[PDB]
Design a protein around this ligand. Sequence first.
Ligand SMILES: [Zn+2]
Lengths: 185, 63, 438, 123, 46
Amino acid sequence: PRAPRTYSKTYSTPKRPYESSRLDAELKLAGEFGLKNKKEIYRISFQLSKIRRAARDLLTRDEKDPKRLFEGNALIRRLVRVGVLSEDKKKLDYVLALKVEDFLERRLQTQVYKLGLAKSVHHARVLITQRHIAVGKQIVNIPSFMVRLDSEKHIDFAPTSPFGGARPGRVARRNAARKAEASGE
Amino acid sequence: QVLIDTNFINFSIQKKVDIVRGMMDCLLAKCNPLITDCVMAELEKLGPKYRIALKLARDPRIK
Amino acid sequence: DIIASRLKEDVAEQQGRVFRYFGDKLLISEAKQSFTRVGENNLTCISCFQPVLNKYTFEESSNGDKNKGRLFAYTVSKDLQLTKYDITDFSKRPKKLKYAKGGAKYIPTSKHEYENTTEGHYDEILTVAASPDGKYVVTGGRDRKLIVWSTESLSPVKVIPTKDRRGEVLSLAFRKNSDQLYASCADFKIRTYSINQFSQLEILYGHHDIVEDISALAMERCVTVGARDRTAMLWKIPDETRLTFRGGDEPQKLLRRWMKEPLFFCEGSIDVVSMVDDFHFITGSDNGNICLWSLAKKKPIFTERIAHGILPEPSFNDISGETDEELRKRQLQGKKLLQPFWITSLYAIPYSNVFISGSWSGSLKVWKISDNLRSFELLGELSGAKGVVTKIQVVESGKHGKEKFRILASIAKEHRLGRWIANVSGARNGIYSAVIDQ
Amino acid sequence: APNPKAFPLADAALTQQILDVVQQAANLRQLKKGANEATKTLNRGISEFIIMAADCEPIEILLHLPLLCEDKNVPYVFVPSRVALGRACGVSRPVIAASITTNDASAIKTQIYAVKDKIETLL
Amino acid sequence: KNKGRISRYLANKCSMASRIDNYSEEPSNVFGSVLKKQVEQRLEFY
Ligand SMILES: [Zn+2]
């Protein structure tokens, strides 16, 4: 005796999911950025398509029309908040010209590897899901965080980790126990 | 950058799709249409029945 | 009327806007100046403790009665030397009372840096604070520990390792007559501390680049300047909020406003802040432009030019190395090289409308705020410093009518952060006593 | 009639922008400091672009570089304060010449390219 | 090792001297004197 609960499929699906071009595309992207799922790639590209299509129609609309102007500044402000569009090309032509590889760059773990706290994308992945890195206060563990500028200047370690902080973890403290054991037995 | 041919222009006018807006419709981004001089001459040597399609395909948006 | 006015001062001193505007009656002209040279170098800090008869209850601020309300001081240098000084003899100079040092004998044998818990100082003390009850003297440095000494026996008694690989202790400000403490570190962070229980209350993130300088009052609103990113922020603990304030000023529009009737240097950095009451604060940038700000708006209330002077320009031979004189000075190239001075030290007198800006620029320049609260002016100079003036405090004594004020400052030969000292003329390491009256 | 050989110096604006990018490079290890290392970096060919100061004592120590920079078509700019350059470098002493090295694996790669484009415009 | 330190140092100084007297038209032997007196000062160091 309530309302229907809210839900919606948050990704779309390509029209030719088996083709050499699209397949090698997904191969090269997923290998260069350490992914595992066609779901991840297709979902990012779907959200991009939504953004780009709405911006397309609102660029076809006429100039000096507050609908076009206000909606365009809304989407440009969203994108400059995210960081994927530059500050100086703030135009509808450049939200159109944006594409997938920029978002695959501005994904979080990508920034971890570029900044070089770990020397592999896969090291970055296992580090984030083993809970060692935080921007500011909360320690994130979803490697699809979509980090903006206001945090990308603040990606940091965990000061409760035994990496950048406190007492040894599980294996190092067991090895400490058993070197003490080898010391005292 | 796209290359337009005689069959493309023909079926474009037979289905009433304006060129650049139809291109933005297809590609979802910014794109420029180009035709070559050989293609222009091909339409020309097709000739007098398709002169309206010729006057269309010659438009100073098409570099 | 006199006793009612004095009691309303002593009660409403904790709250309200600016009340004390005592620049006029001061005899700045004969402000006596004295410098005491210390043998070892790299004096980061001196900081005083004033034992005040609290207007709530009249016991004393001292922990015992052996102090009798005598004015305390502590001087620390990057040779890791902490020496407690007495500053209560006003005709005379401060006194080197108690000495303690740190060497290379406290570096952790175990590099885990969690238990960095050797009692003494091994790595580069850079900041210190006397507790305004005199209860302890607290020390932070590049060691990334907060070592608290009992002051009289100069004993390291408790330690707070700041559990960081990079979080070197940079700037410190004691909240006025509380038991909270304000540390600010260049891992883009500000820490709120407590020594009454030896605890660490809160962590605060939010600048882009490393934060530089901090100020606060008896209220829980700390303003911090972070430098290259050109931002200050006010951080209010009790509601847990942070209000951001920026500049980004443009010398282009500056020179065009001058043409609509001079030397304009863009803000490369910020150095200092001082919250002179709990709605207005000064911020010192790097190109000399000193900016006073009121709380509600995002822009400053005022931005002033070259205040510590501009720097002079070098000579023909030591720029060019060519024999021909005219080619030498066309390599000096004219004015396309010039530089304005910097603002390293700036002391705001508590709950007042004055502030003292001094550096290696050879002259402390003192400023007063007009009581419409919309500008400050450059009043005066003091000249007894010969060295780069790092850290200033002030001790006032006497009766309420005619007070004797003391600018007491740590002075080194090298800058606060790096060396960078552009070969200063007239420099010595020591303690700077500047006694003004009324 | 001929220029001083530190040609060309930049706007205060381009100076501010360059100092921020070199500071972030100092953070991310891709800044190397010092004229000697700049020379070796140009010989290795792994140098992306060059900042120079125009105030050291004297300026021919820094003036040896334009030959190499024009030799491998490398952009090189001038800033008038070695002490501001050192403050940007985050080091204990003024620096007279700094190299931003090559990595395509960067976080500030786009900003490096942007300022490099600015240099090529002002050349 | 030690004479290696001395020679490394004077090699660096010589590099500065070579560049200045290369690009500069006519020399600065006052700075030459600075460099040589610094050489003798690092010599009285070691
Ligand atoms: Zn052809």
